[PDB]
Design a protein around this ligand. Structure first.
Ligand code: HEM
Ligand code: HEM
Ligand SMILES: CC(C)(C)OC(=O)N[C@@H](CS[C@@H](Cc1ccccc1)C(=O)NCCCc1cccnc1)Cc1cccc2ccccc12
Ligand SMILES: CC(C)(C)OC(=O)N[C@@H](CS[C@@H](Cc1ccccc1)C(=O)NCCCc1cccnc1)Cc1cccc2ccccc12
Lengths: 453, 453
């Protein structure tokens, strides 16, 4: 299998037998993508075990894969097992089972439903404030991934099930635990070298999702379903949709995938944002000023005031450019095709190296720097929406994007209304990224929180 | 997985864990199909390991699967590994790779090409006669599977490569051996219980085709290709087609599958025919008379005289009804569908129990008896072409049917022109079928050959 890219005349590193190029992952997906872009140029290939991965960087080519030829050729992401019943999760389903779930859950993430979810997301920003203030009156450095992880979990439970917990002070509630539990850890590298073992593990009901987590949430949902039936969150929006319609095991899968999609992403991004704010105190100050110009007297943000804050949107987008937590985007080529002059054989995984593209000098001036002005209403027109893809692009992009941006912004407004964030001596400057398989700091971000009082 | 047919309300035997119903194969596919038709009626289900197989017997339903919904829903047969490069063999390829090979090789089996192949198939009938006459002048019972196996091989080599051998007297020629080498033998039952092992064996290049056979024929073809290039058989018909076009490894796969398709089928059917002729000497006598009425003075049969013999066609079809060497027909349901009022879930293998249908009293009077008159020009109109399916039906039926019928008939004319076949004391009467996984006699058919001289 290791003669395909050599046969198509596509450059790339030379693969060892069995392993492919996976030894190149010793410095992380992102460093390997960067080195590969620099070495081989616009298009290259490599092998995840025996799996040919063809990396592309042409905006027209990226556009054709993610948007134009989605329903026909590039419909699925690369397979993932063992998954068990999570096969029905939208992000894992394939072909016509996805296209059906994508429709049942699309009206769940409309602007109308999202503005309604704002008051509930607003109540736990206040919870975050009081909890941050307890840590601000003491004088001890704050770990963001904990205080934000507690907040991100607070929004999920309330916006997906109506379960109302202060998870930071209730870290030992049974509903809070099922969730805090890396494609370069020993198991998945083994899966990439021995993918012939996935069908073994699937017949043994061994699931990459912990079987106790999914067993707890499955019965926890069926309790909520028959307590409301009969006597604003995602579950209620999915129950109303099954009233082709959403099944009862399908509905529990999506609820899990919503948490598993929304938890460490929301938490880890606010951490990258607050890091950048504290190491560029000017940007934090201007953001604090725009916040107080729109919401004077520490006013509670609303849906419309959040869309009014332009410098806030710039800080978010610039952070996501720096740290695009997907790192990559991937589609499985289900048929032989020629797009933009390049023949792609069936079965190849086409990959768009997001992190690398977001840091390419040929598209960004001083790409390593934190310059929110790249996205000002003046310059935001010069950015190719296929070079900047933090939520991906096309019919299979992030279905929760609007919710994510609105969630993270409501947090930042309330937190910056009341506090200022200054680096510590133990704050890692410059921040270094984890050489693992997840986009995250090598050491958790720790900052000093002060009160505007 | 073992709750599907119970959920759809479809009757059938109860499956043990892991095994499914495979213990019911202890008396052969055919006895199990018969018992199942009698017990459960028109539609039933069972499990090959974990694989749901839904058996159908409604002619309209059979018609929809094999003909109407072929290109959309029921395009492939149930998977088969480990196969290696024989994935490209027409009978194994899937979806759009099959539909392309089916077209490249369809004009190879036209009536025009087949009438041209008749003189070459005629030369080795004479070889068979002299060889049978050597065994007729002695006085020793003749094993048909050897004398016919030698003949069937003779037609293949000459009609597929131009290789001209008297295989019966040259049993030790290297080209003759690569070919004489059961889905109920230990390996394939293991594959049916542990199908998660096929991807293991495929990455070990272990192939159900012997790797020495395919390595011999691969290089043997590339010798013929460049000796004709540049300086009437199947290879030449496939070389002219690649002049989307047929590849060089694709072309060797089909050549193998033509032998492997045409060898034990042609050989074993003539054996079933000569058995029935010898145990019904009246039918053999009438067939001998029709043969001599069309070809007087032991004339050499031609293409048109073969299509003129009506009682010969009746003997063939009635034998194939009795012994339909496919036993079953199978299609993999690639999408959820409802046909003829029955919902079929995606992935289920739909199976048509040919052998059972060919022996159903509700469609055949005295079905166990050898009555060639069922197919006379009077009664041949009352036979549902979906109840009688010796070559299957629809766009994925036997591509070599015309060649097979013409091949077996030319053999029978020449053999019956010169000899008469009478049972032995060691001839198994009534013939008993192998309880294994292939349709064949439990003991090889042995008959006494006499000369009309
Ligand atoms: C900062 C927050 C987030 C970022 C940066 C992000 C990014 C992404 C990206 C890049 C993709 C793949 C898009 C593609 O393949 O082109 C994706 C998919 C997805 N996201 Fe997110 N995401 C975020 C938050 C969320 C949230 C809060 C949810 C809540 C439900 C969510 C649900 C999903 C789902 C279901 C998919 C799979 C979509 C599909 O396969 O149809 N995401 N996200
Ligand atoms: C008495 C002789 C034969 C009988 C009874 C027979 C019967 C069958 C049957 C029942 C099928 C499956 C049809 C279906 O799925 O509906 C089949 C397929 C096939 N046969 Fe035969 N066959 C015979 C001889 C031959 C010969 C001589 C060849 C020579 C090339 C051949 C080539 C094929 C191929 C390639 C397929 C697969 C077709 C496809 O998948 O497109 N067969 N045969
Ligand atoms: C690794 C491999 C090459 C084999 O398969 C990919 O190609 N890797 C995608 C699968 S990881 C997986 C992680 C996970 C699974 C189940 C439950 C929770 C997490 C996954 O399916 N999560 C789906 C959506 C979760 C999500 C996370 C972040 C943002 N939004 C949604 C990685 C992947 C798939 C789909 C969307 C993604 C979005 C961002 C980052 C990775 C995403
Ligand atoms: C057993 C399983 C349920 C997993 O898979 C089926 O469903 N079993 C079909 C595969 S057996 C296989 C045997 C074979 C393979 C490779 C080389 C030679 C023989 C096969 O692929 N041979 C394809 C065509 C050969 C042929 C034989 C007889 C007549 N014409 C053609 C069985 C099967 C598939 C396709 C056509 C068949 C025709 C008659 C009988 C069986 C046929």
């Amino acid at each position: 299998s290791h003669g395909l890219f050599k046969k198509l005349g596509i450059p790339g590193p030379t693969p060892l037998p069995f392993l492919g190029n996976i030894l190149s992952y010793h410095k992380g997906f992102c460093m390997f993508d960067m080195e590969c872009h620099k070495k081989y140029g616009k298009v290259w290939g490599f092998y995840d075990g025996q799996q040919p991965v063809l990396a592309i960087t042409d905006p027209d080519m990226i556009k054709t894969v993610l948007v134009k030829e989605c329903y026909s050729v590039f419909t699925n992401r690369r397979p993932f097992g063992p998954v068990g019943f999570m096969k029905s999760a939208i992000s894992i389903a394939e072909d016509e089972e996805w296209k059906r779930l994508r429709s049942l859950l699309s009206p769940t993430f409309t602007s109308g439903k999202l503005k309604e979810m704002v008051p509930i997301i607003a109540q736990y920003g206040d919870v975050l404030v009081r909890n941050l203030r307890r840590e601000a009156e003491t004088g001890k450095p704050v770990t963001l991934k904990d205080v934000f992880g507690a907040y991100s979990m607070d929004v999920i439970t309330s916006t997906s099930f109506g379960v109302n917990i202060d998870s930071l002070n209730n870290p030992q509630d049974p509903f809070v635990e099922n969730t805090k539990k890396d494609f370069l850890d020993p198991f998945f590298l083994s899966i990439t070298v021995f993918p012939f073992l996935i069908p073994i593990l699937e017949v043994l009901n061994i699931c990459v999702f912990p079987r106790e987590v999914t067993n707890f949430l499955r019965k926890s949902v069926k309790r909520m379903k028959e307590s409301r039936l009969e006597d604003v969150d995602f579950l209620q929006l999915m129950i109303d949709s099954q009233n082709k319609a959403l099944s009862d095991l399908e509905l529990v899968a999506q609820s899990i995938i919503f948490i598993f999609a929304g938890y460490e992403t929301t938490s880890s991004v606010l951490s990258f944002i607050m890091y950048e704010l504290a190491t560029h105190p000017d940007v934090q100050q201007k953001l604090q000023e725009e916040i107080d110009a729109v919401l004077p007297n520490k006013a509670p943000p609303t849906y419309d005031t959040v869309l009014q804050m332009e410098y806030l949107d710039m800080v978010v987008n610039e952070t996501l450019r720096l740290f695009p937590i997907a790192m990559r985007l991937e589609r499985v080529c289900k048929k032989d095709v020629e797009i933009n002059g390049m023949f792609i054989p069936k079965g190849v995984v086409v990959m768009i190296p997001s992190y690398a593209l977001h840091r390419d000098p040929k598209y960004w001036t001083e790409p390593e720097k934190f310059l929110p002005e790249r996205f000002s209403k003046k310059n935001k027109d010069n950015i190719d929406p296929y070079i900047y893809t933090p939520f991906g692009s096309g019919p299979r992009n992030c279905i929760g994007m609007r919710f994510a941006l609105m969630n993270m912004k409501l947090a930042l407004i309330r937190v910056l209304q009341n506090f200022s964030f200054k680096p510590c001596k133990e704050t890692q400057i410059p921040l270094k990224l984890s050489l693992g398989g997840l986009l995250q700091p090598e050491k958790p971000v720790v900052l000093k929180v002060e009160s505007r009082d």
